[PDB]
């Protein structure tokens, strides 16, 4: 569970993300794919992109990233009260896309990495910890939803 202060730190840095959702989404996926190439295999249409510049030039990948970060942003703003916005997310990622919880940890690392790289003055130790707790909570609750749907994350 997060304090109100921690949620404010999360939402404050998220406001910085919202200044360039597309750009953040691209950097997060670039970071993710380079750190964990196996995650690229879950994308039938992005497995062809070879370089960083090609990934940045992909409108498909850019739209995909906005979709994910938008959904995450909406979840974060619920400050933990996100069961309703988590069920559809869990359902598509467990039954359709088959995304292991381990992969959600990977993109979480990428998120924290990109947020630090872009906003060092707004993402200090306290802000990083709060975001980590927020993302942990997200993964925790979605893992439970996974199980309810009969998928071992
Ligand atoms: C931060 C957590 C994540 C959020 C919030 C998120 C959110 C979404 C949303 C909102 C969609 C569109 C609707 C849907 O299919 O559910 C989507 C599609 C997808 N996501 Fe995620 N996602 C997350 C992590 C991941 C991870 C880690 C992977 C795998 C590496 C992944 C792979 C996919 C794929 C493969 C699709 C559908 C691609 C398509 O539209 O053709 N997602 N995600
Ligand atoms: Co993605």
Q: How was this structure determined?
A: X-ray
Query: What does DSSP assign to residue 97?
Result: S
Q: Helix H segments across 36-98?
A: 52-57, 59-76, 83-91
Question: What is the resolution in angstroms?
Answer: 2.0
CATH of the domain at 118: 1.10.490.10
In the chain, the number of structural domains is 1
Give the ligand at the shortest distance from the Cα of 109: 1
Does residue 110's CB lie within 6 angstroms of at least one atom of ligand 1?
no
Which range of residues forms the domain containing residue 130?
1-153
Query: What does DSSP assign to residue 151?
Result: -
User: Cβ contacts of residue 27 below 8 Å, gap of 6+?
Assistant: 114, 117, 118
Dist CA 116 CA 118 (whole Å): 6
CA of 120 to the centre of ligand 2 (A): 24
């Amino acid at each position: 569970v997060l304090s109100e202060g921690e949620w404010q730190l999360v939402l404050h840095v998220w406001a910085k993300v919202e200044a360039d959702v597309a750009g953040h989404g691209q950097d997060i996926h670039i970071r993710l794919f380079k750190s964990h190439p196996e995650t690229l295999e879950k994308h039938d249409r992005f497995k062809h992109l070879k370089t960083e510049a090609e990934m940045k030039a992909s409108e498909d990948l850019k739209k995909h990233g906005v979709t994910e970060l938008t959904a995450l942003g909406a979840i974060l703003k619920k400050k933990g009260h996100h069961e309703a916005e988590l069920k559809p997310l869990a359902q598509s990622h467990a039954t359709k896309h088959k995304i292991p919880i381990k992969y959600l940890e990977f993109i979480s690392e990428a998120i924290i990495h990109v947020l630090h790289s872009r906003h060092p003055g707004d993402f200090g130790a306290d802000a990083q910890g709060a975001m980590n707790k927020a993302l942990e909570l997200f993964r925790k609750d979605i893992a439970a939803k996974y199980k309810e749907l009969g998928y071992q994350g």
